[PDB]
Amino acid sequence: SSRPATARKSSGLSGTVRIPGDKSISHRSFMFGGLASGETRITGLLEGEDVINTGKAMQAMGARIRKEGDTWIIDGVGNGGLLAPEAPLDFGNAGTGCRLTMGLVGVYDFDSTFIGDASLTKRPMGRVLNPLREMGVQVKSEDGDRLPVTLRGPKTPTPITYRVPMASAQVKSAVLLAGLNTPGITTVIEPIMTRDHTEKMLQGFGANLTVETDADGVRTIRLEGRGKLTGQVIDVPGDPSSTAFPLVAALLVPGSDVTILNVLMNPTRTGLILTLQEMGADIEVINPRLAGGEDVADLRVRSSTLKGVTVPEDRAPSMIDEYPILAVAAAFAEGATVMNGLEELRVKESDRLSAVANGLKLNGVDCDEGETSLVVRGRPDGKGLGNASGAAVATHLDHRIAMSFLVMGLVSENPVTVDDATMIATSFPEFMDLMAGLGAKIELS
Ligand SMILES: O=C(O)C1=C[C@@H](OP(=O)(O)O)[C@@H](O)[C@H](O[C@@](OP(=O)(O)O)(C(=O)O)C(F)F)C1
DSSP states (O other): OOOOEEEEOOSOOEEEEEOOBOHHHHHHHHHHHHHSEEEEEEESOOOSHHHHHHHHHHHHTTOEEEEETTEEEEEEEOTTOOOOOSSOEEOTTOHHHHHHHHHHHHTSSSEEEEEOOTTGGGSOOHHHHHHHHHTTOEEEEETTTEEEEEEEOOSSOOOOEEEOSSSOHHHHHHHHHHHTTSSSEEEEEESSOOOOHHHHHHHHTTOOEEEEEOTTSOEEEEEETTOOOBOOEEEOOBOHHHHHHHHHHHHHSTTOEEEEEEEEOOGGGOHHHHHHHHTTOEEEEEEEEEETTEEEEEEEEEOOOOBOOEEOGGGGGGTGGGHHHHHHHHTTSBSEEEEEOOGGGGGSSSOHHHHHHHHHHHTTOEEEEETTEEEEEOOTTOTTOSOTTOOEEOOTTOHHHHHHHHHHHTTSSSOEEESOOTTGGGTOTTHHHHHHHHTOEEEEO
């Protein structure tokens, strides 16, 4: 079952906190550490349920994973060394773990079955299964290419040149991981850049992987298959998607001054910050530095008055997971915020466009949901927003919908209630404690 939570209007949020590790990089740390030759040591790993599930899947295939002190230590099997899993690989709510692992293991000559929760089971896998079919993988899936899915790789996979049809880092990632156990050169062409953790990390593990960007922005990513991968020391940066919740809360709640430490600033992950700045947000980037091979900085955020803006379709890939929290910020901005190019939101943990639109309307916000867009008109003072009757926002098992609306309740005249807070631990188990520490009033059922 589920457990509702209600956020109440708060006086200023104040403090300095370290945000939990980046989920995208954490998944990949377990995957590459488990596949590589030798030992991989990870500090700052996100210990949310999603990442733990990826770790269990890697253990099921031969990697030894353990936590010594604050460091995760992995003994990898070496590229080409994955062992046939005894049972289905359960990815729970994690699209990333599921999609990437399908590419990783689908090209091995043994059966692998993939299962997950009610949310993951409704999401499209065709975007990853199609290129795998081209590579020679045999696929048994449910209608619409949905889980459960059983894969059986060929004795010798076929390397392909695949142009990713939508701006998905997961599809790009799955094809590159499939390429690791495929002889020849696997090439992924990305017309619009998506988060590049797979490319950067594989290069760090020693893969012969190159990225060439045409002057028009198109990326050609080449990977030589069946090459050695060497265990690495990894230092995981703070999650910029998780940072978005206390960051927007500090912008919206009057009398606020919050500093978030060690935040990943890779530009494929900072579209929300750029957008909020255009809206008038007071976000100071402090001590930008290089840590664990990634750009990081600390962010000092103070209460700001915001004005609606137009958010272009080409900025979407760089903030795709932050549209829910951006929609909440827009509900308190002067004027209209217009966001298009949102088709991808409909296939996430929940259809995020529909879930955000319904939640906003339930909480008195004037907005228009289009097939691939959202327009939100705000009420800066928060009057008439929220839900006095205590009606709950339907989260549809999507932890980002739950966190976004809980942030809204810290600002609206009336409290905001979400029907379930249990999925927040999939990527941000520290959420309740972290927000409470800053002064937020959130009551869990
Ligand atoms: O490769 C990655 O690490 C991710 C790539 C993106 O998906 P696409 O390739 O489909 O654009 C994100 O939207 C996804 O984040 C979510 O990732 P999960 O499904 O839960 O794993 C999220 O955290 O909200 C989202 F997809 F739901 C994580």
